[model samples]
Each structure stands twice: as C-alpha cells, then as structure tokens.
Target: SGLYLFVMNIRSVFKLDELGSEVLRIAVPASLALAADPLASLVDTAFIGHLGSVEIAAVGVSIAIFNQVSKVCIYPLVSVTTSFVAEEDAIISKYLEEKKRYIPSVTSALIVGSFLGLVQAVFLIFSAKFVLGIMGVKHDSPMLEPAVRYLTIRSLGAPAVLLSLAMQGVFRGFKDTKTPLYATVVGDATNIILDPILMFVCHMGVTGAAVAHVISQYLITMILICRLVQQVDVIPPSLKSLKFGRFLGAGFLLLARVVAVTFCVTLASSLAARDGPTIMAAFQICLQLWLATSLLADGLAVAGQAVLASAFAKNDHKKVIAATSRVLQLSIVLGMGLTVVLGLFMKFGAGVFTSDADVINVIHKGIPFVAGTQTINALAFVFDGINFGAQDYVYSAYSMVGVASISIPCLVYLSAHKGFIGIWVALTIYMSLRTVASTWRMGAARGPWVFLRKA
Candidate 1:
C-alpha cells in the first residue's frame, strides 16, 4: 500500500491544472524577486570587475563575509516568518475575521527582522577589516582596503535588507509574491542605474559600487513597507502580545540549519580566496552566478511552503499531497532548464564580469560544477521549503547540521588536495547530501508525510 501510494504521488506530477497554476503564479514572481535581489551584487561584481582583478576579488570577499554572517539571521527570520505567519493566517483568517488580516506573527517577524538587521549592520560595518583577514586577505594585500571600504558601506543597509526581507516573508505567507517582486525589480534597477554614474562618473570606484547597493536596499525596504502597510495590519493591538518566544523558538532551529548551509558555502569561498586574486576573482563570478541562478528554483520552494503550510493548517491532507508532488516535479524541470541554459551560455557570459584572460579561463573551468549541480541544488532548496511547510523544524536543523559536519571535512580534504576544483567538488557533495536528507524524510514516510502509508 505504501508502494502504491508512492506511485500515486509520483504520478501526480502530471496534474498540472489548478494546483500547478497556483504554484506557478507564486513561484514565478517569487523566483524573480529572489533572483533579482542578488542581481544587485551581480551588478556590483560585474561593474567592479572592470576596475581590475584585485578590486573584484576584494569586493567578493567582503560580500562573502557579510552574507555568511547575516544569513544566520536572515534565512531563519524569513523562513520561520513565512511558515509561522502562513500557519497563523490560514487558521485564524478562516475561523476569525477575514477582513482583519492582522497576524501577530507578522508583526513579530518585522520586529525580529528589523532588530537583527540593526545588529548585522553594526557587526559588519566595524568588523569588515578583521573578517577579511580571516577570509585569507593578507595584511600586505592590495585587496584589504577596498574590501573593508566596500563592506563597511554595504553594512549600512542591513536594517533595510533584513526588514524588507522580513516584509517579503509576510507577503509570501499571504500568498502574494508579486509585491516583493515589484519592489525588488525596482530596487535592483535603482542599483544598476546608479552603478555606472557613481563608479565612473563620480569617480568613486568601489565606494560608488557599495554606496549604490546600500541605496538600492533601503529603497526596497521603503517600497515594501509602503505597500505592506496599506494591505495588511502590520502593527499588533499591543506590543506586549508579540510572539517573541514562539518566533525565536522555531527561528533558532532554522538558524542552526541556515548557519550550516551558509557556512559550507562561505567556507568554500574562503578556500577559493586563499588561492589568490585571479582565482578568487574567477570564483566570485561563478559563485555569484551560481547562487543567483540557483535561487530561481527557490521560487518553487516558496510556493511549496506557502501552499503546503496553508493546507496543512487547514488539515487538508489531499491538498498537501498534490502540492508536494507538483512542486517536486516543477522543480525538476526548472533545475534541468537551469543546467542546459547555464551550460551552454556561461562561456559567453563570462566576459560581462571580467575582461581579464586569466579570470575568464578560470571561470570556464568552474562552469561544470556551477551548471551541473542545479538539479540537485534545486531539489535541496525545494525539500527545505516543503519541510518547513510541514513544520519540520527540528529535523530540518539537525539534518543540515549533519550534512555540514561531513561536508566541512570534505571541503577541507578536497580543497587541500584539489585546490579550486576541490572546493567545487566539496560544494557539489554538500548539495547532494542536503538533497538526500530532505528527500529521505519525505520519502521514508516520516513526520508530516506519515500519511503516505503502506500495509
């Protein structure tokens, strides 16, 4: 019977009617917003790459440091906020006031997001110099001053980044990805538009790039807040009623998971940075492109989380089953699509990030891992979103930590022996292991998926 049910679920991949349409609607815009936000950095990297190899490498290291540290706060805040607020909204909105649309969890997420943003800003701004050192920037390196300069300026936008991302989670929980999508497109446009004018016209060099990014982030936050307040009740009846403990409870678990996730990537970047500016510059383009492209699949993950969490909240096991099957199927197609597109075009695309012959050559070599891992990478992201929908926080946290423990050693061994290729190999292993953990939970019929029963 379990085997039979598994077959049935697998077949539901073709059920591309209402559920598929809904997921697409959510996934499409969510993917764009998620993808476009990263384009700010991609824009920065490409524009900065024009200045020279060290400039690009320096900027890349600083970015790695900030993102790795802040993702601990950012990922958990956004994920838990989405899941919890989705749950609260689904249950309460149905039984309670439909028009009120005021979720206490929404208010709470903003509070947490804004506070975490402030802390991230303070931490990154002052600590950029020291953090760069750890990322393998030698004291005598030309990369140090530019890296620190860019990171400090970029750190000023933390509250905006976090707050906007927090707002995005709430909007996502409400099943409206379009709001964030519009906000992000505008903000990213702002960044790219400002990049040349500031970098070259104003003669700010890297500082112009960093300043433009900060302005873009704050614009995104402002746009989100404006749109958000008009639609939903952002403020609670009482600040005393905020779910700090509840938010932090699940939030921290996912914090562990995100830390593990980002750490592996960050470790890979540090290893690459240790290799030298030319190698690290090449790694920067590939890593940035890898993540931005990979994040497109996260839109599907977001759709899965929103739909499944809402369905689970309503006790609609049927809805949950179909949603899961459809997203996995959609994600598979999306991942494959990424691989083919990236595999074919990345060679041509390398020049946009740099004109240096050496860096371009290195990027060519890194292309295989960047493109090849998309399918597994997409699945890993999908499973994470789906599991969060199941409120599988503890398992999510533990499973990721397990994968990281192993991957860290693999990263150490491979990077030591294989160099650049080794770092990529280790990352490939990490993504594959993560996919297994996520797939194992759902496939083994554990926890929320226990409904897929056998005789």
Candidate 2:
C-alpha cells in the first residue's frame, strides 16, 4: 500500500491542468522577480570569483553584509505594505471605484522605507570598519581594506535599493507582479553587462562590483517610480494620517523571521572568514549556490500560498488539503532534480569562478553540502507556505524562534570545537531540523492542518 500510494502521489503530481498552470502563472513571475537582485549579486560573485580567491573571499563578506542590511529593510516594508496596501486598495476598488486614486498606507510604508534607507546607509557606510571587525576581519587582516571599500561604496545606493523594493511592495499588494518583474529584468541586465566592463575594462577591482551594483539599484528605483507615478497619488495629505504604529506592530514579527535565518548563515560565513580565504572562498560559492538553487521552492511557496489563502477563507477544506499536499509533492520533484544536476555539475563548473587550483579543490570538498540537502531545503520552504496558508501565524512565528535558538548555539559551539566539515554537518542538521520541526503539526494530522486526518 505504501508503494502503491507513493505511485499515486507521483502520478497525481505529474499533471499540469488548469490548477497547475495557474500555479505556474503566479509562481514563476513572483519567484523570478524576487530572485533578480540575488541573481545579480551571484553574477557579481561569479565575475569576482575569477579575480582571485582573496577577491572572492573579501567580496563575499561584503555582500553578506550588504544583503543582510538590505533584507532587514526591504522585507519589513514589503510585508507590511503588501497587506496594508492590499486592504486599502481593495476598499477603493470595490466601493469607491469611480473615485479611486490613492491608498494612504502605501505612503506610510514609503516614508519609513525612505527614512530607514538613509539611516542604514549612513550607519553601514560609517561602521564598515567597526562592523567588519566584528565579522572576524580585524587587525592586519588581508581582506580588511577591500571589504570596507566594497561595503561602503555599495551603501551609498541604499536609498535607491530600499525605495525600489519598497515600491515593489506596493505592486505585490496590487498583485501586479509584472511591473516588478520588468523593473528587475531591466536593472539586472544593466548589472550583468556592466560588471565585467567595470571590473576588467575599467580595472575597478572589488570597488567596481559594488559600483555596478549600486548603479543597478538606482536604475531600478527610477523605473519603478516612473511607472508608479500614474498608478496612484502616493503623496499623503497629512503627517498624522500615516499608520506608523500599526505597520510597526505588523512588521515586527516579519523582521524577526528574516533576522534569525540570515543571522545564522551570516554567522557561518563570519566563522569561515576567520579560518582562511581559500576556506571561505569555497564556502561562499557553496553557500551562494545552495541559496540560489533553493529559490524554486520559494516560487511554489508564493503561488501555493495564494491558493491556500483563498481556499481556507472560502472554507474549501478539501481544496485546502489538496493544494497544500499538491505543492509539497511538487517541491520533491523539483528539489531532487536540482540535487542530481548540482551533484554532477560541480566538477565541470568549479573552475568558472576561480583560477587557483587549491581554491577549486576546496570547492570540490564543499560541494556535497551544497548539493546533498537540497531536497530537505525545498520541502522545508514549501512546508513554510502551508502553515501561513492555514492562517497559522502563531505556530509559524513560534517555530522560527525554536529553530533559531536550537541552531545558532549549535553553530557557535561547533565553529570553535569541530572541524569545517563539522560546521557543514551542523548546517545540514540545521536544515534537517527545520524540516523536522515544521512537520510536527503537518505530519501529525493535527493542529491547523485539521483536514489532513479526515482526508
């Protein structure tokens, strides 16, 4: 029966009828758009990877710093604005259709995003040395100057980065995924074209990577704002009318979710930075590929979450179970597909990023961790959307704390006592634990997934 049921599950998931098409329609655009910046960052890494192991190593740390800060602002604004803008946008579209022109909360999100943007820029720009020191690059460290140059140069474009992603929040709220997708495509194209020229033609070194990246962010901001002007009257009438406290409340939990996850990954990179550049170079490539490949599940999470949200609301309990299980099944198919490809391709692809034989060899050593746990990674992410779709925010939020607490201390302890492989082993366990922790309710036929037992 288990074998028979497994076949049925696979057979069922293989179809791509109306529902499957619908999922793909929403999934890929939303997924691809969000991946644009990360993809550009990856391109930057790949190009810089050829520079030397030390350049890749320094650039890697700088990016980790830049991105963590970018996400810290971007997500909170996007998360808060998505719901808040959607609510007010719906009210205008539904009842005040003829008079529809503006949504006030959009301004609230924009204001803080703009405000938060410069503060972080100045902070990041000013504190590069201080922060880089804490990141394990202190006292005559070879990477100290280049990384400081990269991070500080990149921070100058912080406003553009924040404003663009913040505006992207408003678009997502309107369910207008295409605009953001277009904006990202245009910007990412520029970034890709400019990276090699700036680095090689102009001989900018790590600074060139940061410069090209900053240029892309500003270009993206310009495009989004240009398109946004006629969409609504974004300017507000009164300062007191803004919903700061409310967004402050709603956005807090969202921030915690990202912080906990980035904290640990960044922690591992920091640990690697402490050990050696060749070691860190391998880990950087390893981690970047690991995160890049993991984006497929993110696609399903968004697409599937859209369906699940509606399903639960209409009391379509049967459909809820179906879609929830459906996405989970697809994650397996896609997840494992990646594992096979990455497992085999690393040998041929390792040299694309680095010229040094030793760095390439180290990357070979780290490839398993990148390729091996992918199935768990994808499943864990989709299992993510299921909880939210069930409207189980409490369980979802609390479980984050549990995973964070359990894993961070483990990582800290291992970096000191265990071998580098032990760190990867701990990371593998970390990913495994989130999968295990999440399944506590989903696999149990209990909690928010009440219909699973009935099914």
Candidate 3:
C-alpha cells in the first residue's frame, strides 16, 4: 500500500503548471550561472592545453587541490546561508505582509564569508607547495613548479570567491537567480577574453591562467556586492543578533559531508597524477566536462531547496509535494537531454581541448562513462536540494559520509588496478549510490518527508 501510494502521483511529475513554471524560473538561469564558470574553465583548459601536456597536467593538480579546499570551506557556509536566509525571509514575509525591514541574515553571512575567505587565502598561499606535494606532485616531478605557481596566484582570489558565493546564497534565498547569472556571465566573459592574451601573448604560462581567474573572481564579488547593497542593508544593528553559532553549527555538519565528498575526487586526482602527465591531463579534461554538465542539474537542486525551504517553513505540504515532484521529473528529462548532447558533442569535439592524439583518444574512452551517468547525476543532485530544502541536514551529512566510505575504497582499489577507466567506474558507483540513498529517504516517506504519507 505504501509503495503503491508513493508511485501513484509519479504521473504528475510531467505536468506543466504553476509549480513547473516556478521551478523553471529559478532553474534555467541558475543552470546557466552554474555552468558559466566551468565553461570558462573549459576555455582555460583549451588554451592551457596548447602549452603542452605537462603544463595542463600541472594546472590540473593545482586546480584539484584548490577546488578540494574551497569546497570544504565554501559548501557548508553557502548551503547554510541559503537555507537560513530562505526560512527567515519566508517568516518575515508571512508576518510583515507589505512592510519588510532589514534582516541580519544577509549582513551576518557577508561578515562570516569575508572572514573565512581571508583565512582560506592565507592558508592556501602559504601552504601551496605542501598541498601540491600531498596531491602527488613530487619535488622531482616537472609538475611541481608550475602547480605551485598557479595555486599561489589563484589563492589570491579566495576572498572574492567566498564572498561572491555567499551573496549568491542570499540572492537564491530571495528566489532571485538572475542577478547571480548576470554577474557570472560578465565575470566569465572577462576571463575568456583575457585567457589568450595572458597565456600566449604575455607568455605567462600557468601563472597567466591563475591571474585571469583571480581577476574575474574579484570582478564577480564587486558586482554581487554592488547589487546586494541596493536590495538589502548589509549592516546589522548589533553583533548579538547575527546568529553566528547557528551558522557554525549547521556549517560544521555540512563541512564534514564536504570533506568526505571532496576527498574521493581529490584522491582520484592524486591517483591519476601518479599515472604520469599524459593520463592526468586527459583525466583533467574529462573530469571538467563531466562535472560541468552534471552541475546543470544543480539549478534544479537550487530551485528545489529555495522553494521547498519556503514551503516547509509555511507548512505547505501540498506545495512541497508538487514542487518536489516537478523538479525531480524535470531533472530526469534534463538528464536525458544532456546524455544525448554530451554523447554526440564529446565524440567529435574531444580534440577541441587538445590536439594531442593520445589525450584525445583517452577522452574518447571516457565519453561513455561521462554520458551514461547523467540521469543518475541529475537525480542525485536534485535529491540533495530536496533534502536541503526540507532542512534535513543531519541525514544529508550522515548519508554522504556513508557514500564516501564506500566510494573512497572503490576509488583506491580501482585506480590502483584499472587506472583511468577504473576511476570513472568508481565515480559512477559513487553517484549511483548517492541517488539510491536520496531516493530511499523520500520514497519511504521518512524524516521530513513523512508528510507525503498523508498526501
């Protein structure tokens, strides 16, 4: 009976109504904004690929290390901020009706984000070489020098990246995705335009890539800040009202999840680096495209989180069911669409990132794994948003820890025996497990999803 009930409304997932419209309004722009940076990184990869496989591989290690660290710090902060702001704003809207006053959520988020950014910048700058060494770039390896240089230069933009993401969370909570999309477009446009001049004309090599990325990050931060000032008063009346403890508490949980999540990918990069530069370079290209496209579904997740958070706060279970169903359905459709697009494009287009015949061949080998996982990726990502929207932080944290526990060993053993293809195989297992866990929670009507039983 329970199973039948759960599957009954599955048909409504296809319906286009107010719920679908709302999800699209948030999802489309959010998808573009999410994909923009990676698209810019794709451009970076193209230009950097021309510099030689060694340079591309070195930059890949640096990027992996930098991203791992950033995710650990940024995900928790941004996730918590989005949920907190959404819940608070919804309550204020309910009571205040027409009159809305200054809220401390935005102000507190900026202060915390700025402080964390500074800490990250200093840590990464000072520890760049150490981190690269840990990432499997030996002192004697050719990749060491350029990786150090790139990581150091890019570390300068930590503050901007953190601040921009924090403000993006605030905007998302307000159900405004367009501002972030515009900001990311302008910033990435600057990055694309400067990549060639800095890398080839100025002969800066990997350092040029790092500098271009940094400048664009700061530009994004400034743009988001300027727009944010117009919308909300960023200064709070007193520090006591800031809810720092609440942010830190929730953040700590997500941080644990982020650490577990990032460790799997970082370990894969390290293992790939151990294979030699050619393989690592190929892995870099494939990994970037894999994540870039997978993240398209992240827009749906963001919309789900924002909408569900608000609805949950208002205790509107019908809206919750409708919104969740619509987004999940949309994710499946989006995933299928991406599977077709990436399959076709990557087959003929692998050469765009590199002219190296070996690297292109390896990328061709990875195309299947990359394309095959889109539906799983979409479901997993949307489930994350659904969970986060319902404020099921504890479950999210614990389940990811479980997923990582299983994934890390798979990554290690497979990479040791199977090499590059093995790593992709492990990632497929990882994402699939994530989807299953998320699906189980809702399908069983457990936790905050218990309301589904009544529906």
Candidate 4:
C-alpha cells in the first residue's frame, strides 16, 4: 500500500501542468542572474592572467577571502527570505491585488548588507595585511600590497553585494527572476567595460579591478532597490503588524547551516594553502571551476526552493512533488553534463588562466575527483533548496553542522597525510554528507514535510 500510494502520489505530483510555468519563470532568469557575476570573474581572471603568476595568485586569494565572507552573509539571508516572502505573498495576495512586498525585502537586505559591509570594512582596515600574510602571501613580493589594497576596497562593497543578493532572493520568491537578471547583466557589463580601462589604461592594475567591482556592485544594488521601491509595500502601517520573529528564526538556522558548510570548504582551502604555493594555485583553479559549475545547479535549486515553498505553504502537495522530482532529476543530468565537459576539457582550459605547467598538472590530477563529484554536489545543492523551501532550516543546519564537525578532524588528518588529493577527498565527503543529511530530513517528514503524507 505504501509503495502503491507512493507511485500514485509521484504521478499526481509530476503532472505537466503542476509547476511547469512557475519553475521556468523562476529557473531560467535565476540561472542567468547567478551566472553573470561568475562570468565577470572569469573575464577578470583572463585579464589578470596576463599579468603573471604572482599577480594571479594574489588576486586569487583575495577573491577567495572576499567570497568566503560575502557568501556567509548572502546565502542564509537569501535562502530564508525566499521562503518567508513566498509565505507572505500567499496571505497578502488575497487581500490585495497586484500585491508585491519588494520594498520590505530590499530594505531588510540593505540593512543586513550595510551592517555586514561595515564590519568587513573594519576587518580590512585593521587586519588586511594580517589576513593576507596568513593566506601565504610572501612579504617580499610586490603583489602583497596590491592584494591588501584590492581586498580592502572590495570589502567596501560587501553591503551592496549582499543587498543585491537579498533583492534577487525577493524576486525569486515572487517568481520574477527577470528583473534581477537584467540588473545583474547591466552591472556586470559595466564592470567588464571598466576592468581593462582601469587595469591596463590607467595602470591601476589590481586596485583598478577592485574599484570597478565595487562600482558595479553598488550599481546593481541601486537598480534593484529602485525597482523594488515601486513594486513592494514597505510600510506595514505599524510596528505591531510586523511579524519579524518567524523570519529571524529561520534565518538563524540557515545561517548556522551556511557557516557549517562554508567552514568545511574554507578549511580545505586553508589546508591546501598550507601545503605550498603549487597546491594552493591548483586548488584555486579547480575550486573556481567547481564553484562556477555548481552555481549552474544552484539556479535550479533556487527555483525549487521558491516554487516548492509556495506550493507547500499553500498545501498544494502535488506541486511540491513535481518540483521535487524535476529539480533532482534535472540536477543529476546537469551534473553529469558538467563532469563530462570538465573531464574532457579542464586541462586544456587551465592554461587560459595560468600557463604554469606544474599548476596545470596538479589541477589535472584533481580534475577526476572534481569531475566525478559534480553530480553529488549538484544534488546536495538541490536538496538544500528543497529542504529550505520546506522550511527545514534548523534540521538542515544542525545536520550539516553535525556532519562537518565530525569531518573536520578527519580532514585535518587526511590532508596532512594525502596532501592535495586529501583536500579533494575531504570535500567530496563533505558534499556527500550534506546530500545524505538533506535526504534524511525529507524522508523523515520534518518541518514543512510535516504536512506531507506517503502520497
């Protein structure tokens, strides 16, 4: 009976009309929006590549640190807010037509972004040199000061970057991804135009690149905020009407998950950095490629989160089932596609970023593990979105933290013994555990899953 019910439920959920338009509406534009910044970074890498290995290495580490800090703030807020806004839309839409709460989302994002950016700026002012030194920057190299300057300036954009991310999440919740995509494209195009002009023409080099990035970030935030102002109702009429506690609760849980998950990856990179320059550089290239590809999956994940959250919130179990099946199915296919492409082409592609044969060779050795794990990584990301959509943040966060807490000691030991390969293996394990944990949460019917039955 359980098996029969499951099959029937799956069929009911997977019907074509369930969430077809909603998924497409959310997924495609979200995909393009997510891809834009990474593409710009690719362009930046290409430009920086010509400068020399030291320059490339310095910029690489600088970017990594910026990303590590930025993502921690962005991911949880974005993840939590998407569902929160989706829930809000369900209730509000009945009372008001053409009801969009874009301003509250943007305002919350700006407040969070501004706060995080200020903290980052303080870290930069006081500890930029210390931070770089720890990342293995050689004191004698000319790249040291430039890296410090670039990172500090880039840190100034943390608020804008995070605010833009928040707005994007808000749009996704509304099942409107096109506006964010348009804004991102405009900002990135502006950055691309300025990169060469500032780096080569003005000879600002790394600093110029950093300046361009900051300008573009603010521009994106401004555009998003302006649009949000018109479409969303920010004023609740009274503070008594605002229910901030539920959002905060979910946000905190997701924040814990982000910290835990990001910590594992960051630890692997730290281990690689300690191994030596060659290993660090190889890891950087491989990591960047891995991040870029996984983000493709992330686009699908975002859609699944937004659509499924709304579905589940509205007690539309059929939509939930369809979204779940299709997201995981598509994620697997895309993951395999990435694996095949990278496995065949990564070695040749490495040269575009760096010509160092040694670095290229190390990356080649790591590519197998990297390529093989894309599917696992993709599924993990998709599952995360599903769980988040289900509002299972606390369970997800604790599960991930439990897994990562256990894995860290193992990682330290393995990386020490196995060198660069150890880092890859550890990361693979980390992602696998996340997938397992998310899967377990879904099967157990916790959180939003409480409403779902066997069918």
Best by TM-score, which number? Answer: 4
Descending-lDDT candidate ranking: 1, 3, 4, 2
Give residue 129's lDDT in candidate 1 (0 to 100). Answer: 76
Please, what is the whole-model Cα lDDT of each candidate in the order they appear? 0.85, 0.75, 0.85, 0.78
Off by over 4 Å in 1: 1-16, 38-62, 94-99, 132-150, 195-211, 266-293, 345-373, 410-429
Q: What 10-residue stretch in candidate 1 is worst by lDDT? A: 1-10
Displacement of the residue 290 alpha carbon in candidate 1, Å: 5.4
lDDT of 1 by residue, 1-455 (tens): 22233344666565667897889888899877766766676776788889888888888898878776666677888889888888988887454455646788889988888898999889888777778888999879999999888889989888898999899889888889999999989988999999999999999988998889889999999999888888778878875877788789899898878778888988999898888899899888888778877777888899999999899999898878878878887788788999999877788878887989999999999999999998888888998899988989999889989999999999999998888889999999999999989988888888888877731
lDDT tens readout by residue for model 4, 28-52 = 8888877777788888888888767
Q: Cα lDDT for residue 144, model 1?
A: 97
User: What number of clashing residue pairs does each candidate have, in the order they appear?
Assistant: 1, 0, 0, 1
Model 4's TM-score against the true structure: 0.84
Candidate 3 lDDT tens digits, 1-455: 12343344577765666777788888889888877777788988999999987898899998897776777777887788778888887876554344335567787789888998988899988988888888889989999899889988998999999889899889888888999999999999999988888988999999889898899999999999998887766776676777777777788888887777777777888888888788899898888887778888888899999999889989998888778777877888888999899978888998888989999888889889888898888888898888888887788889989998999899999999999999999999898989988887778888988877777
Weakest 10 consecutive residues of candidate 2 by summed lDDT? 1-10
Who is ahead in lDDT, 1 or 2? 1
lDDT of 2 by residue, 1-455 (tens): 11121133466685687567766765788788867767776787789988877777677887778777777777667756655665566555455455437678778777777888888889999999998888788648888888899889989888888888788778766656678889899989999999999988999988888888889889988998888876887877676677778776656776777677777787788877776888778778888888878887776876566566556655677666667667878888888999998877777788898897877887788788889999989988887766655545456666777887888888878876764665777788789887877667576666776655555
Per-model TM-score on C-alpha atoms: 0.82, 0.76, 0.83, 0.84
> Which is superior by TM-score, 3 or 4?
4
